[PDB]
Amino acid sequence: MKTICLVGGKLQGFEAAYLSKKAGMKVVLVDKNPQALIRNYADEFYCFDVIKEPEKLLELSKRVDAVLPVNENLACIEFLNSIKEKFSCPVLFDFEAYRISRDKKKSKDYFKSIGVPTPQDRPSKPPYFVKPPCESSSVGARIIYGLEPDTLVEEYVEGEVVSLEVVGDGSHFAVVKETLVHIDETYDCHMVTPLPANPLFRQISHDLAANLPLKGIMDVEAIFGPKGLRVIEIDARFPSQTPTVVYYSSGINLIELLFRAFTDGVEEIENKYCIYEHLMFGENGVLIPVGEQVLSMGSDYGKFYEEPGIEIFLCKGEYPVFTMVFWGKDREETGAKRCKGLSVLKERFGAVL
């Protein structure tokens, strides 16, 4: 049995912990927040700030098999970079790739440098899509029909938002499984489903990783627009939501693949269906779809229910949020599991949907 140390206990942390458990790994969480979201989900919890007490993390590195940064605190990421040679286990991260990926303008420059289509900057005709240069979870992302002079202003590209994860070992780049990102009125993601292979998107994703070169994990987000595929962002860190759908639909565990990239290396290149979604239990049991932004305001997050083809996680807080995971051999069976999972909420908690 191996042990993984996660630095950060919110949504990235949950995803990493979930897949680590599927891999039969013990999960050690480090987080500066005594109320860290997944503190009770991890097998062990150590509450400290790694910047203030690096010696504690370095000591932990002696008794775990890998350390995985799962936060987007730049101060933390840059500090870990400065001490990474001191760890007694691999640090599963690509710091240079993250530096490019975190800055959306820098990323777009990179896309252009290798001939990858991306939305036109500063269009003359509405609607415009605007977003901060360095946020995630769709924070500050809005459609416009005096922003910071550093705000990204783009043409609005209509169509499917599609995600691909790539794990690189520096030499080989394993492009995994296409997923559909279902957006809400805030452009946050409330649902994820798998998609058939897209050879063009796979090649683009491969080339984005290969030209770095990627040693770590990165996802690629593209919109399948009316005039073709346009890559909107890359994020060189462990993502939330999509890796669960990747796991059920393809059989590939992204935590195991990432761990392999830093130990044995990786090789390039199941077909089930999966529905992943968040639902808030509102006033009087009204079920409301919500995005990640809502889930990250929670106070406690862990497993609520399981049966064959159904996993339900409960995020406690101001109005409970359920994360529902359904899988089966095809859309029909998975839809049947979704109904059963919903009816559990209906009969148990008097939920309405």
Ligand X SMILES: Nc1ncnc2c1ncn2[C@@H]1O[C@H](COP(=O)(O)OP(=O)(O)OP(=O)(O)O)[C@@H](O)[C@H]1O
Ligand Y SMILES: NCCC[C@@H](N)C(=O)OP(=O)(O)O
Name the helix (H) or strand (E) containing 83. Answer: helix 74-83
Residue 31 assigned as binding residue: yes
d(CA 331, CA 249): 11
Position closest to ligand Y via CB:
136
The residue type found at 64 is: V
d(CA 48, CA 254): 27
**Binders of ligand Y in range 112-171 (CB under 6 A):** 136-138, 163
Residue 163 assigned as binding residue: yes
- 154 forms part of the interface with Mg ion (CB under 5 A): no
Contact stretch for ligand ADP (CB under 6 A) within 43-51, 168-176, 180-188, 342-350: 180-188
- 183 forms part of the interface with ligand ADP (CB under 6 A): yes
- 242 forms part of the interface with Mg ion (CB under 5 A): no
Residue 239 assigned as binding residue: yes
- 192 forms part of the interface with ligand ADP (CB under 6 A): no
d(CA 274, CA 277): 10
d(CA 232, CA 296): 23
Q: How many residues bind ligand ADP (CB under 6 A)?
A: 19
Among 240, 244, 253, 334, binds ligand Y (CB under 6 A): 240
- 219 forms part of the interface with ligand Y (CB under 6 A): yes
Nearest to 166 by CA among 248, 232, 252: 252
Position closest to ligand X via CB:
8
Where in the chain does DSSP place strands (E)?
3-7, 26-31, 44-47, 66-69, 128-131, 142-144, 152-155, 160-169, 173-175, 179-183, 189-194, 215-225, 228-235, 273-281, 287-289, 300-307, 310-316, 321-328
Count Cβ atoms below 10 Å from residue 328 Cβ, excluding itself: 20
Can you spell out the DSSP letters for 241-275?
SHHHHHHHHH---HHHHHHHHTTT--------EEE
Residue 219 assigned as binding residue: yes
16/30 with CB nearer ligand Y = 16
Residue 221 assigned as binding residue: yes
- 130 forms part of the interface with ligand ADP (CB under 6 A): no
Residues contributing to the annotated binding site: 10-12, 31, 49-50, 72-73, 104, 131, 138, 154-157, 163-165, 219, 221, 233, 235, 237-242, 292
Residues contributing to the annotated binding site for ADP: 104, 131, 138, 154-157, 233
**Residues engaged in binding ligand Y (CB under 6 A):** 136-138, 163, 181, 189, 219, 221, 233, 235, 239-242, 292
